Structure 1
Amino acid sequence: YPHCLQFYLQPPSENISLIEFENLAIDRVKLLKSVENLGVSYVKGTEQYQSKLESELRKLKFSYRENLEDEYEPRRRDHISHFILRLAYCQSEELRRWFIQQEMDLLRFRFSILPKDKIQDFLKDSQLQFEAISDEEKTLREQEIVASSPSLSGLKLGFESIYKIPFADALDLFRGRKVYLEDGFAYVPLKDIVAIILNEFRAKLSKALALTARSLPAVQSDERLQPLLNHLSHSYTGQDYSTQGNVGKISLDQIDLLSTKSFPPCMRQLHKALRENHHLRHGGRMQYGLFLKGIGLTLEQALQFWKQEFIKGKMDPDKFDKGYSYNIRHSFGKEGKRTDYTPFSCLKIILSNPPSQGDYHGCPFRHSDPELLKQKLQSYKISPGGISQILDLVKGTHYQVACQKYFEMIHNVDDCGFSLNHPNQFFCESQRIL
């Protein structure tokens, strides 16, 4: 926001608590993972974008309050966070791209916020050499500057400040004769000056993500950093919420109804399964099973639910206990957790246990095939043009985003008002809305 625009150059020499080290990353990602969403559901020139964007930039504490020369709260957060999250995103050339992609969509926003003035000071100072020209040289050479410029309409050489740079640094533009040159100097505005920044910024960033890997072997050894290197997007969410405990009061004969208006695609499929087929595969008794406690089911009820829903499947009332009661009692209760009490995260249901013929678990938007999905979504009665968006997404791989797009439509609104990342959550919002 302020002298908050910074070329993540020159490494932090400080040191932190594994508590700050770990929180800077989870957070620094949450941001970068929100820069990703907004760029997917909106455009780079909208208020909603600019707004929410700086809104999170805000909530994650990455542009705000000052202090005595050294310790500038947000300044710091962003500096470390970035570098630390250079470790994680240095590996896969598919992450290196994605990182650069979203850490450059970020410098862009922190530039779209500063007035033609503050951005100026930042340059003079920044790297090293750049100069502005007085209105004397400015208008004296005005006409010639507008002649060298693009299809730039009119003869208007606006108030828009103009800079003087070494012809060599503006190669990208003088090669096409897109700026005025004089005794070895180019004259360009802000738009283009910026793009050159962003340009040299990517190239340098990539360069680094390169030298980050090379020397990665000297730490993978450390035990505290496995959860970062390996798991910043595994089963464990950007920072999930809905865990255990929590409250709620659900009657039973209502689930059916809620199935239409509350659960998301995933669970919607499963209930029908369990109601139609009177049973559910292993993979399934768990996705839904959990999720049900998370919405608040009770030990008593859970058993009730399944039991009576397994007896319509003409089973032995006694065989349930002997075979299912056990697992179900565990779920709710005690230890041996992390996969028996942790209602599935979305990123989870999306990357583990895909489903096979007979299985109705997993994420539709991800796992069901285009056409079938198409056939499914129409039963939910989603505008054929609407369905047109969703699948456009599914083609991008922004799977839950789509779920989002679905939330909105079944609920009637222009913006759900949050970034989804877990079934129950999607369950609750659907309840706040009632």
Structure 2
Amino acid sequence: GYSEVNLSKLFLQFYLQPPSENISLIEFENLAIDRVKLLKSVENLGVSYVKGTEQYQSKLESELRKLKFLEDEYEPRRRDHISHFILRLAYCQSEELRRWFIQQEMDLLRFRFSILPKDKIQDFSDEEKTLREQEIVASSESIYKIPFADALDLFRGRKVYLEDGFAYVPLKDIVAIILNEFRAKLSKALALTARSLPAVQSDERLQPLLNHL
């Protein structure tokens, strides 16, 4: 760990907050290379099979186990968190790379979320449930009350029930919501990162990361 790298100075999850940590350049550089292969694996499977298939569910689960992504699943959590914020520096350089990095990270969350328990999803009535059953079936399990404004793509196509300014969405459709608001915050962060970069860009220690994209 002779070489060192300050992340704080340099800067399933939405990767909102940067990591405030000092890490080795070897961890840094290797951790990048690790996640790169992962995203390239997602892109190959996305072309090969179709998301949802057990093979896809089985194969990506393997590569993730391979690339190391309670405290048992904590070491990958730190790896996944930090690895992502490094690649932000790589793929913010161009729309193609941004789109590419996004699209792979997009497909990533789907799977990570596909293998998620319903209990934890909520964290990250029964009479009223059955009372509005008909009104929703005709429009478009658990259902959540969102301000309609945040459900734009849904109600603008009449794929959900509205009442008193709030949408009533299923768990099937709520995926693309979180998936898209995330797509915005990320493409936003990338756009920001694209501003932050040309001060550190010249750094040799970052050369292999900015070239071997």
User: Is the structural similarity TM-score above 0.5?
Assistant: yes
Q: Is this contact kept in 2: 1:100–1:205, CA < 8 A?
A: yes
**Residues 248-269 of structure 1, C-alpha deviation per residue, up to 9 Å, x if partnerless?**
xxxxxxxxxxxxxxxxxxxxxx
Residue 177 of structure 1: how far off its partner (Å): 2.2
Residue 147 of structure 1: how far off its partner (Å): 1.8
Q: Is this contact kept in 2: 1:24–1:77, CA < 8 A?
A: yes
* SS of residue in 2 equivalent to 1:45: coil
Q: Is this contact kept in 2: 1:166–1:186, CA < 8 A?
A: yes
Q: Is this contact kept in 2: 1:165–1:186, CA < 8 A?
A: yes
Cα separation, partners in 2 of 1:12 and 1:36, compared to 1, 3 Å: same
* SS of residue in 2 equivalent to 1:163: strand
Residue 100 of structure 1: how far off its partner (Å): 0.5
**Residues 365-418 of structure 1, C-alpha deviation per residue, up to 9 Å, x if partnerless?**
xxxxxxxxxxxxxxxxxxxxxxxxxxxxxxxxxxxxxxxxxxxxxxxxxxxxxx
* SS of residue in 1 equivalent to 2:196: coil
| Root mean square deviation, CA, Å | 1.7
Instruction: Quote the residue 2:8 is aligned against.
Output: none
Cα separation, partners in 2 of 1:71 and 1:38, compared to 1, 3 Å: closer
**Residues 14-66 of structure 1, C-alpha deviation per residue, up to 9 Å, x if partnerless?**
1200111011100011111111111111111211111110111111000xxxx
Residue 196 of structure 1: how far off its partner (Å): 0.9
Instruction: Quote the residue 1:201 is aligned against.
Output: 182
Distance 1:71 1:144 in 2: 42
Q: Does 1:189 align with 2:170?
A: yes
Q: Does 1:29 align with 2:36?
A: yes
Q: What is the count of residue pairs matched by the alignment? A: 202
Residue 107 of structure 1: how far off its partner (Å): 0.7
Cα separation, partners in 2 of 1:107 and 1:118, compared to 1, 3 Å: same
* SS of residue in 1 equivalent to 2:199: coil
Residue 71 of structure 1: how far off its partner (Å): 9.4
Q: Is this contact kept in 2: 1:28–1:82, CA < 8 A?
A: yes
Q: Is this contact kept in 2: 1:116–1:161, CA < 8 A?
A: no
Residue 224 of structure 1: how far off its partner (Å): 0.8
* SS of residue in 2 equivalent to 1:148: coil
Residue 208 of structure 1: how far off its partner (Å): 1.4
Q: Is this contact kept in 2: 1:89–1:96, CA < 8 A?
A: yes
**Residues 83-111 of structure 1, C-alpha deviation per residue, up to 9 Å, x if partnerless?**
10111111122111110010111011111
Distance 1:87 1:190 in 2: 33
Distance 1:93 1:169 in 2: 26
Match 2:110 to one of 104, 108, 111: 108
Distance 1:101 1:13 in 2: 27
Misfit runs of 4+, over 3 Å: 68-71
> Structure 1 length normalisation: TM-score?
0.45
Residue 118 of structure 1: how far off its partner (Å): 2.6
Q: Which has the larger share of strand?
A: 2
Q: Is this contact kept in 2: 1:104–1:202, CA < 8 A?
A: yes
Cα separation, partners in 2 of 1:25 and 1:112, compared to 1, 3 Å: same
* SS of residue in 2 equivalent to 1:181: strand
Unaligned runs of 5+ in 2: 1-11
Distance 1:92 1:168 in 2: 31
Residue 183 of structure 1: how far off its partner (Å): 1.7
Q: Does 1:140 align with 2:131?
A: yes
**Residues 261-292 of structure 1, C-alpha deviation per residue, up to 9 Å, x if partnerless?**
xxxxxxxxxxxxxxxxxxxxxxxxxxxxxxxx
Residue 221 of structure 1: how far off its partner (Å): 2.2
> Structure 2 length normalisation: TM-score?
0.89
Q: Does 1:161 align with 2:142?
A: yes
**Residues 124-182 of structure 1, C-alpha deviation per residue, up to 9 Å, x if partnerless?**
xxxxxxxxxx1111001111121221xxxxxxxxxx11111111111221122221112
Distance 1:171 1:91 in 2: 30
Residue 187 of structure 1: how far off its partner (Å): 0.6
Distance 2:33 2:24 in 1: 14
**Residues 219-263 of structure 1, C-alpha deviation per residue, up to 9 Å, x if partnerless?**
11211110110123xxxxxxxxxxxxxxxxxxxxxxxxxxxxxxx
Instruction: Quote the residue 1:372 is aligned against.
Output: none
Q: Does 1:57 align with 2:64?
A: yes
Q: Is this contact kept in 2: 1:116–1:190, CA < 8 A?
A: no
| Highest RCO, 1 vs 2 (Cα 8 Å, sep ≥ 6) | 2
Distance 1:206 1:102 in 2: 13
Unaligned runs of 5+ in 1: 63-67, 123-133, 150-159, 233-434
CA radius of gyration, larger in: 1
* SS of residue in 1 equivalent to 2:146: strand
Residue 117 of structure 1: how far off its partner (Å): 3.1
Distance 1:43 1:191 in 2: 17
Distance 2:194 2:146 in 1: 34
Cα separation, partners in 2 of 1:48 and 1:141, compared to 1, 3 Å: same
Distance 1:28 1:103 in 2: 10
- Correspondence 1:170-189 to 2 at 5 A: 170-189=151-170
